[PDB]
Amino acid sequence: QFEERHLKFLQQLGKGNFGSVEMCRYDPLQDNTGEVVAVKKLQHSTEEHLRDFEREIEILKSLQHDNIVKYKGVCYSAGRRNLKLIMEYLPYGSLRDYLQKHKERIDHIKLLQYTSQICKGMEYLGTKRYIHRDLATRNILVENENRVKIGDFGLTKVLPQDKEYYKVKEPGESPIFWYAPESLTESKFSVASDVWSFGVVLYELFTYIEKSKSPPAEFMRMIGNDKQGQMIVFHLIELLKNNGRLPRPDGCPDEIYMIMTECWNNNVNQRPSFRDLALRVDQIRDNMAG
Numbered sequence: 216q217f218e219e220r221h222l223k224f225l226q227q228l229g230k231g232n233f234g235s236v237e238m239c240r241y242d243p244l245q246d247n248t249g250e251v252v253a254v255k256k257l258q259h260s261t262e263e264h265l266r267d268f269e270r271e272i273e274i275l276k277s278l279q280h281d282n283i284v285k286y287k288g289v290c291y292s293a294g295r296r297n298l299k300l301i302m303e304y305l306p307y308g309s310l311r312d313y314l315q316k317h318k319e320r321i322d323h324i325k326l327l328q329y330t331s332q333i334c335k336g337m338e339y340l341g342t343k344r345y346i347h348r349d350l351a352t353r354n355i356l357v358e359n360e361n362r363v364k365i366g367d368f369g370l371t372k373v374l375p376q377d378k379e380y381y382k383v384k385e386p387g388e389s390p391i392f393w394y395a396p397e398s399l400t401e402s403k404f405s406v407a408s409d410v411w412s413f414g415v416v417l418y419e420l421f422t423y424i425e426k427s428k429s430p431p432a433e434f435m436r437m438i439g440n441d442k443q444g445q446m447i448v449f450h451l452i453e454l455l456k457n458n459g460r461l462p463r464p465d466g467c468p469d470e471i472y473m474i475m476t477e478c479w480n481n482n483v484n485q486r487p488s489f490r491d492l493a494l495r496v497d498q499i500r501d502n503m504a505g
């Protein structure tokens with residue numbers, strides 16, 4: 216529970232899109248010597264959005280792991296008539312921007328360490344039966360040069376007891392290019408569909424966030440760049456189901472690409488678990504370093 220009077224705006228961070236994160240100073244001396252926090256708020260609050268935002272707050276509050284952005288609290292702002300989420304602020308920002316800026320510096324050994332940390336945070340989510348549904352480098356944060364955290368849980372879902380999947384049908388936009396085929400065809404989300412998206416995340420790291428090599432640019436190039444609207448989806452589905460995949464990024468080792476391909480399996484049941492992935496990645500790193 217943060218006091219609204221001591222919460223001062225700084226900059227924006229990520230806009231919604233049904234939500235927005237700001238950089239704020241928590242400064243309740245008012246001295247201007249204060250802790251910098253990340254503040255999430257509703258962009259177009261409504262009854263369904265508030266119920267959804269409350270679920271998101273409970274999701275993050277329930278998570279305590281080295282590879283998950285720390286939940287700080289809530290602010291009952293505009294005098295206990297508005298709800299805002301308080302999370303820790305990470306100066307290094309998104310992994311996406313971090314890798315775009317320091318690409319020379321960040322070598323393969325380093326990308327695998329980040330890859331492994333994402334797996335571990337993903338493993339912990341599975342422990343609580345949470346489906347992230349939105350794995351992407353822009354949703355991963357850098358704490359320091361040696362550590363990454365999963366930084367957003369806006370689309371996160373709790374699986375019903377003993378359910379393997381959650382069918383969610385939503386209006387509006389979806390990050391189609393990070394979706395598993397069954398998520399595109401039947402709105403089915405599961406740990407396995409998070410494994411598929413993780414495979415796309417690994418692809419993003421190895422392309423070093425080079426624009427012309429991004430999953431949307433690569434799929435559109437395979438689909439045909441002319442296509443608009445619904446025709447993109449039809450073509451994406453047909454391509455994926457008949458094993459059309461993202462190409463191997465330039466200079467990416469074959470063993471690392473094989474990991475990506477195993478995650479991109481049309482058979483949900485045949486996709487590796489996050490524990491299998493963290494083990495393989497850590498062994499590869501260890502068989503390079505140690």
Ligand SMILES: Cc1nc2cnc3[nH]ccc3c2n1C1CCNCC1
Nearest residue numbers: 228229236253302303304305308309
């Ligand atoms: C871009 C960015 N930098 C952040 C630092 N700390 C944060 N703590 C929580 C978010 C968060 C930050 N973000 C993004 C992450 C993805 N959604 C928008 C904000």
